[PDB]
């Protein structure tokens, strides 16, 4: 009984690219799993750091901020990822 508090909700897009953007409540401990759909990968991102770029992105602590945008590559791929938090 100890997951994160996070919520994946549609963020910043453009065109070829989209950003989502994750609002979370602790932060401190960042430990979700992104779980992309086997094709986009991350291009950039702010507000805290990644752990990876491509199948499973863990974001990881470097400051206080527990919203974080990450680009999607599309080249193919209309589904949104989401940032997992839970224990199971």
């Not at 499973?56 to 590559?73: C, K, L, Q």
Request: hydrophobic share 30%; aromatic share 10%; proline share 2%.
């Amino acid at each position: 009984t100890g997951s994160c508090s996070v919520s994946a909700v549609r963020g910043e897009e453009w065109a070829d690219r989209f950003n989502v953007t994750y609002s979370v409540s602790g932060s401190s401990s960042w430990v979700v799993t992104l779980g992309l759909n086997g094709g986009q990968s991350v291009q950039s991102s702010w507000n805290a750091a990644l752990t990876g770029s491509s199948g499973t992105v863990t974001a990881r602590p470097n400051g206080s901020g527990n919203s974080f945008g990450v680009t999607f590559y599309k080249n193919g791929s209309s589904a949104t990822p989401g940032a997992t938090c839970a224990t199971g």
